[PDB]
Design a protein around this ligand. Structure first.
Ligand SMILES: O=[N+]([O-])c1ccc(OP(=O)(O)Oc2ccc([N+](=O)[O-])cc2)cc1
Ligand SMILES: [Fe+3]
Ligand SMILES: [Fe+3]
Length: 299
């Protein structure tokens, strides 16, 4: 592995642990002697694994007070109905738009169906909270989240990947929980893979703004672990660069009369192997196609 990327379960920093699979992690923040927060909501089929890992660090789960959610995609909120009932004092903090999603029938349907596709043959999910019954408090762009005496995180709107996406910045630690707004970090090549699934102009504007944060020490996307050193410092800028590079590649190939699919299959082939364990294959290729449709339209 690489010194600049922490990608093992367990303790990452004095106050921060990784629960579950590094590909779809849940982060555990220790806010004080008797108080904790989770960040990112995972996939439903990992409920027992994440529960098990949580109970190793947290003797009393009633001390889990907050659960921060970056966006409504099925792989970032799948655990909520299954673990919220075991966390009697938890408050889920999400954007207004993300909250809206959990109150839409069609939306919840998609999230459940994509989560069910990842179930292994054996397993049963535990009893679930109704999605519209989750203990949520909507948070606003620019809001300060006073989680504990040494944990204060600012909510920053970061749409583009999705129309509801937010990130959470801990300026004390120069630590940014970025969700999928920078794309997917390619563990093999050390570069960002763009994930433009809603709006290219918003996605790029969000990265412009994140580049203006004070220099990052820790950059924690939605998949793959914790990035540090130059990868954190240069992250938002690099993510922007990689988006433009994809745009131009698309423009090249289309100018050679290629159809949206040549590049899609090329991307699905070049990148699909990293997510195969949490993205159904038809979804990865289809996500590629959608992103290329978006870039094409807006360019
Ligand atoms: O069907 N959706 O609305 C949807 C699409 C992609 C998606 O996964 P996301 O985590 O946004 O996309 C990724 C795509 C590829 C990789 N990868 O190259 O390792 C990671 C995340 C989640 C939900
Ligand atoms: Fe996503
Ligand atoms: Fe994701």
């Amino acid at each position: 592995s690489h010194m600049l990327r922490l990608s093992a379960p367990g303790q990452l920093d004095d106050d921060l642990c990784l629960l579950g699979d590094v590909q779809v992690p849940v982060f555990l923040l220790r806010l004080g002697e008797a108080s904790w927060a989770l960040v990112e909501g995972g996939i439903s089929r990992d409920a027992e694994l994440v529960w098990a890992d949580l109970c190793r660090w947290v003797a009393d789960p009633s001390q889990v007070h907050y659960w921060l959610i970056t966006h409504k995609h099925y792989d970032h909120c799948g655990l909520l109905p299954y673990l919220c009932p075991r966390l009697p004092n938890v408050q889920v903090l999400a954007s207004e738009r993300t909250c809206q999603a959990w109150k839409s029938e069609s939306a919840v349907r998609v999230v459940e169906r994509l989560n069910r596709q990842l179930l292994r043959a054996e397993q049963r999910l535990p009893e679930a909270c109704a999605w519209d019954a989750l203990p949520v408090r909507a948070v606003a762009d620019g809001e300060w989240l006073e989680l504990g005496p040494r944990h204060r995180l600012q909510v920053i709107e970061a749409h583009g990947h999705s129309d509801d996406h937010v990130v959470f910045y801990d300026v004390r630690r120069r630590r940014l929980f970025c969700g999928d707004a920078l794309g997917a970090f390619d563990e093999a090549e050390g570069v960002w893979r763009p994930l433009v699934f809603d709006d290219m102009e918003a996605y790029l504007e969000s990265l412009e703004r994140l580049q203006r944060l004070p220099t990052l020490l820790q950059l924690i996307p939605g998949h793959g672990g914790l990035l540090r050193g130059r990868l954190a410092a240069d992250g938002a800028e690099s993510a922007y660069t990689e988006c433009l590079r994809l745009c131009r590649r698309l423009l090249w190939r289309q100018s050679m009369g290629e159809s949206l699919d040549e590049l899609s299959e090329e991307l699905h082939r070049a990148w699909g192997g990293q997510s195969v364990d949490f993205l159904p294959g038809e979804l990865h290729l289809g996500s590629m196609r959608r992103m290329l449709e978006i870039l094409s339209r807006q360019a």
